[PDB]
Amino acid sequence: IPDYPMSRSAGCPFAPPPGVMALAAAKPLTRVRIWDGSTPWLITGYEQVRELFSDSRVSVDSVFTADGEEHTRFRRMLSKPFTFKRVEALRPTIQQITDEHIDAMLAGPQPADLVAKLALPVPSLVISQLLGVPYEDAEMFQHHANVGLARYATGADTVKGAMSLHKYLAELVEAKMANPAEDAVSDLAERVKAGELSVKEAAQLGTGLLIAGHETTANMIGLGVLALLVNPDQAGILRDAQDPKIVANAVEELLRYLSIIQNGQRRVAHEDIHIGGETIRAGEGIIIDLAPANWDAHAFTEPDRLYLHRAGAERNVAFGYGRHQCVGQQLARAELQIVYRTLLQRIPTLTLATALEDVPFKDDRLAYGVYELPVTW
Numbered sequence: 001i002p003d004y005p006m007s008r009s010a011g012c013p014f015a016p017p018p019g020v021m022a023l024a025a026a027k028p029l030t031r032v033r034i035w036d037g038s039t040p041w042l043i044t045g046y047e048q049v050r051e052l053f054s055d056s057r058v059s060v061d062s063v064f065t066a067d068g069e070e071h072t073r074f075r076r077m078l079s080k081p082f083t084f085k086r087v088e089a090l091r092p093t094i095q096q097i098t099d100e101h102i103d104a105m106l107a108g109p110q111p112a113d114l115v116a117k118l119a120l121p122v123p124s125l126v127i128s129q130l131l132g133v134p135y136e137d138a139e140m141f142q143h144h145a146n147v148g149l150a151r152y153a154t155g156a157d158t159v160k161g162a163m164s165l166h167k168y169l170a171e172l173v174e175a176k177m178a179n180p181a182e183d184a185v186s187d188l189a190e191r192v193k194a195g196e197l198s199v200k201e202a203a204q205l206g207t208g209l210l211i212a213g214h215e216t217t218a219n220m221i222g223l224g225v226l227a228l229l230v231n232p233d234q235a236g237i238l239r240d241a242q243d244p245k246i247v248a249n250a251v252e253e254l255l256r257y258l259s260i261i262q263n264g265q266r267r268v269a270h271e272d273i274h275i276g277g278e279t280i281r282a283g284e285g286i287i288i289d290l291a292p293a294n295w296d297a298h299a300f301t302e303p304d305r306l307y308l309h310r311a312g313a314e315r316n317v318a319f320g321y322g323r324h325q326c327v328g329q330q331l332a333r334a335e336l337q338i339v340y341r342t343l344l345q346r347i348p349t350l351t352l353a354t355a356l357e358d359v360p361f362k363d364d365r366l367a368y369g370v371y372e373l374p375v376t377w
């Protein structure tokens, strides 16, 4: 019985770990051994990965962990913050923050670290605006969010970065209980006012949103941009594209390719479950593995290929499937749309500043990324 997870390859470093991709060639599903030493069921094939995500005999063992109607409770509370018009309305400020950040990057020296100057700051600012942190508190919020993800930060640094983030979100929650605007925390604040969640639970959740949608999107920006640069054929397409429909699909094809969230929360089966030709005896653990699904040649004809015109690209599960899909979905999509198109058209001479093999990737972090991305232009 093999060990999970497995490590990515040099020379194929965008690719899912080859050892996982092999396993996935044999059986839509195989039994693995993990950190603690328990032996859960790694789901690899696309068709069955979607199924278990959408199967009630399956559930997850705060809204991250909460399940049952307990999850519907937590997740209904999140509907108002990420409606369509609620995210639509953010496209402008996503575009102003990007434009701002690209400028400051152009005005500085080069080679410049795209991670440092763009990939990290833009999500946490966008998350911020969605929450509704006042303008006054942008840089402090930024600081206490970018202290965590620094490759140079202590653990203590990361602790007393999060401590004051929870402390501040509680403040702003109460503040939005007082003065509700149209932002996200006002919505959480509206829920404290109805006996539904304490300030702590709301501060936790606000904190929860920042974490969830920061290093993820950051990593999509960074890795995404890199992937674009070694694939100039595609960079051109994304840059000259004239349809919002087509640029949206090119984001979908980037989420599928990079598949930064390789895993997916560790679920468990309540009843016995028969697919892939084996039986998931109830009780046993389930790991619904998204990279190999996104790289399943049954549904994505040339999975090693980065084809931004790829026909069914929003077929992927880079955001998960079923109950517990990424709540950030539409917002993160806007982010990558904005940032990708805008960088690629304002900086058409953007060039990778080192040999690719020099680039530092984020192996250990569950979410795959690059630690810094030097560009010239």
Ligand code: HEM
Pocket (backbone or CB within 6 Å): 063, 064, 075, 208, 209, 212, 213, 214, 216, 217, 220, 255, 260, 261, 264, 265, 317, 318, 319, 320, 321, 323, 324, 325, 326, 327, 328, 329, 331, 332
């Ligand atoms: C706007 C930015 C984002 C926000 C606010 C956000 C927030 C969240 C939250 C709260 C959840 C938990 C929902 C639940 O499990 O009930 C979640 C799940 C998830 N997120 Fe996102 N996220 C963001 C961006 C991303 C990105 C960019 C990716 C991948 C490229 C991603 C991948 C996922 C996946 C795969 C899940 C589902 C985990 C599972 O079903 O086990 N997220 N997100």
